[model samples]
Target: AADDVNPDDNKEDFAVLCALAALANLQTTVPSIDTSGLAAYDNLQQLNLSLSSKEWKSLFPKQPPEGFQSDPTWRKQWPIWVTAAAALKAENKEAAVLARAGLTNAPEELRNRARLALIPLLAQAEQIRDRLSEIQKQNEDTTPTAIAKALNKAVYGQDKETGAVYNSADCFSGNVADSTQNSCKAGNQASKATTVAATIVCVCHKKNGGNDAANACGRLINHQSDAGANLATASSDFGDIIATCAARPPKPLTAAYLDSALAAVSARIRFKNGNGYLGKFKATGCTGSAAEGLCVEYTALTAATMQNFYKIPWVKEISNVAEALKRTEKDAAESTLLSTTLKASENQGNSVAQKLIK
Candidate 1:
């Protein structure tokens, strides 16, 4: 009030300041009390305040003088202590009313509970962030569809000399290093010459140089299911059509391709037959609308390109992204929930000091 004062302002600080001045005046009138030169204290959570309960009562027998609330609690008794604590408790009841508002800051033990509740979410958020980073790596591959094409090329091919279809030793190096000496077939004997049975052992036995890349590639080639391959083709063809609408396709969605699709659909409708093909559609550019329609047609066909690609990687990538996002959102909610507790704790420092001092 000495330096400067606004006429209309009725801030809490203004009221507290006037009350404190009145309290100071009252303090001079009352006799002072002392303790045994104590430097330490008890019954407190954060701050230090040294005073006896008897001394507090002696200072205010019937009722605390006006402005007592404005003074420190060290010179206070039951009146101020109970009053402030009640005020604090009443303020907290509104937490339920505000839908349990203010997460970061709260009260003694309740504050700790809020803190602990949010930690797991934070840990989960880190895990999700790691998963999302993997998705980033997957997306950055630049040629995801090419991996499927490579797999298709490796798994299904006819012997150049023999007009018969047979699986390659490891796809890349057709030379089957001796089956026994190779260690390639060491793990498991051919259980059956089931579809790709021979091929599975060829990769699993760690045949080629016994290196991780060879082993991994071998495993990749061995596990191509029909649907896995189909989805890869779907994704690949989807991309191609986009490029095609830009007037560049691997080749045009020529009349032949269009007719093939129509033929599949026609067979299905007329013969009640089941075959993969879309309704009448063709690629115009590697463009939208038109390009996308061709992809739809291609996907609907029983074409090996679309039928031999493993698609789980892409599907799992999408799933992981979705999972990651959900976890992060929950983490955010938990953080918001805890913040009110933290902030309230900070603001209560002085009040804690005042209450404990008495």
Candidate 2:
């Protein structure tokens, strides 16, 4: 029969359709909620595009760790898991905070659903965190000189104890020539070593010393190949020199970098303080039992609606959107306007949802 469609089979879809309908109605009736000035909404569009782009897909792990890819519904859920995994690998605490907060403040029903949905992803994040901690601990006492010496041997294929060159591509890939001298003079090997040295310096060296260390390391590698005289001895000797270059004093960051840091701080403060945007929303909109109930429903609905569209944890997406708004509206007056518009929009949405429930 044409009318035999089972609503139970498409519960999430129906819920999303209903919530979107409510949002559309609220937008038409609540004309005072001025979203026009919000750069956040504009930024969200770009984020959505970026998340689905080819460049984004290229960043995915070639072989996702076991238990991460075994989900029956992998098509929809895998990307979200991968996103959290990527954030964890990069040590992105802000993204973790956003996702955690969303789960914490979620309505009971939605909270259960989120927990069920995110178990594997959360486990993956935890594993990554532990792995990073272990790596940091292992690298703690390895001095820059020691690292440089090791890198030099790997790059030049020199024996650690005897310091004798060999025809081996130990560090850089590609087949090494039969003769030791021929292997040491490989241009491709030098280039690869230069890149690896830069990465190591950037990670291990503090502050502005990275560039100096990288340049020094590159020069040493190039020189070892060019001279081809006592290459193994030179590789062993340059380690201390590179370490010296890596010990440069820190430099002050540029104005633009500082400004962006300030912006991120400002965004965090606005969402965290007692008198901040979120606090005000909870205090005024969710004060009474009935109002609180509606507020919870509205928040859940909003989060779900956004998740359906963004395909990311809604809190992370919204946090980025709010940050964009804060960045754009820098002045006191503009800040006030932004806050007012958001509160008004929330209040109207709550009211509409309450009426619909009644």
Candidate 3:
């Protein structure tokens, strides 16, 4: 939308340009994801990715052959002019630059993928960082403030730029740094002692760089996909996002709010077009433990462990127990597709859910 952003102007050309930008956004956002590497995303037999400002200028006569029109008097650097025009029309070069910086630190595969979406995605990242920053500027750093912000965001998520709503953490952690895993809520992972991603998401959500929840969720999806970026790097990305979100969420959502947030999460996972964590849980084979009708104790340790902490919020509320249970009740018919994630492993002091059946 450089000096030229008309939603009603030249939709065909706009669509083409937007398509190009969308492609770029995807590639640049998650460096380790490897765009062209995935058959699902890459199966393009005939791809044309070349476009320059000169080519774009042919349509708008008012636009200089290849520069900015706002400062019309003095001759300006063509590239700078274009960048400015973008900013004027609202393409916003500063945002793009911020976005590119995020890409530079992405995983090996995603770094290059990040380059594709770099130019167009910058505006989005810039806007997100700017917005969350505004909150920091107003409020003293505090947990309640962070939780409220995250919760409000959960209620209504949107792209900071263009004011359009967005579903993923892309709107929250897009432009933030990816390697600063040191922000794990309360700081440092020395106290953690488990092999799970859920707890990572929970702890980071507390205050880890304030990016923990979204990043952890993103990383889980990135690594969990069959065509996923893989676990090691995915973990790093998730850890980074989760830690940051945990550290400074402007308004974190509460447990009641999560009922809806999880649904949004379900949609994002669906959009990624994969089964994700829910699928992985069932694939691992553990539902048999529920066969006792809350009677037979499977294994004292595994059962006692399960009762304490492994219960989902939906399953614990009795006011709307039937409705809540509807969302979480396990079914053997489709049991194989559900994936299990422990926010706090029993070993981590989050406790086990063994109390559920007792």
Candidate 4:
């Protein structure tokens, strides 16, 4: 905690604190740094990426969050319609003391964030789905007995059910499981149900000697009592494992959804030359991008947005995107200046890090 750091300081203070923290982390860690420290930074960075992408997905989930209206028009026109509804209720002709309002920036921001999140979110989802598919296929060739043993070890107790006084870890699973349950396998009630059903099949096969994995697996998958929610035996048994594989339908990641997500995050950014002004030009009628909404409040708002919400590495890239939307172009010189400013943001630490290594 730096004595100089205080929240009352404006944005520059924030920048300062961020600088201090990054410096402090690097100073402490880099000195004792193993390859471990560098990997740790990457881990933290990965976590940041994961959370950020998920938050973007949440607002634009496959099914909209509760009470979310997809239409911006309906949002903007809300007050007018409220007035209409009130007009119906108040017949006497005196002005009803209805509250006045306009569309708040909330929906517009939501739409923008939705757009911002679209591409990254889809990429994350696809990666997760593909990973899950890969994991399910692994170890498919292992024998049923071996699978059962592994599952039992994971969820079952020190003793086989024979001569066994079932301890807290007995059977490793139960229908309604909890830490208090006498089973290691007890878990989400649904998961426990699935697990127990699979374990039962494993126990039956262990005894009756019908090692017909096909029949055993078919019986387990076809049992169908909502056991898929929690499958303790799936950790060991092929039947439970394969049944759990197709547990739920994948989320819809359609092209249209991806398009909407991409469009939602699109934004306009402001670019200034040395004068802190976005250079302006006019034709006889001032006809150009400005007239068509370039350099407009909305455009600047959109651009300023990238700065406000995200601490992304690609400020110049974002600004370039913003500039592309407008008629104005940064001269080569101005572009050079913009590039320098963006690069300088975090490189100061790298300069120190460079010196430290020497």
lDDT of each prediction vs. the true structure? 0.26, 0.28, 0.24, 0.25
Clashes of each: 32, 0, 71, 17
lDDT of 3 by residue, 1-358 (tens): 2122111222222222222122111111100111111111111100101111344333323344544556554233344334434443444443433232342233444433433433443333333333333333332232332322322232222212232222223322221123222111111122111111322222222122221122112232232211011112333443343232222211221234334433332332111112122211111111111110100011222322434212322212211322322322222112222111111111111111122112
Please, what are the lDDT tens digits per residue for candidate 2 over residues 53-157? 355445465444567466565654454545644543446443433342343233545433433443343333333333333433443433333323332343233
- Report how far off residue 260 is in candidate 4 (Å): 20
Best model number under lDDT:
2
C-alpha lDDT of candidate 3 relative to the true structure? 0.24
Which is better, 2 or 3, measured by TM-score?
2
For model 3, the superposed segments whose C-alpha errors exceed 4 Å read 1-143, 146-230, 235-255, 259-278, 281-306, 310-358
Off by more than 4 A, model 1: 1-293, 296-311
**CA shift of 236, model 3, Å:** 6.0
Predictions ranked by lDDT, top down? 2, 1, 4, 3
Best by TM-score: 1
| lDDT against true structure, model 4 | 0.25
- Over 4 Å off, model 4: 1-171, 174-344, 347-358
Q: What TM-score, over all chains together, does every model reach?
A: 0.22, 0.19, 0.16, 0.14
Go through the candidates in order and give the C-alpha RMSD of each one to the true structure.
Answer: 30.5, 32.8, 30.6, 34.8
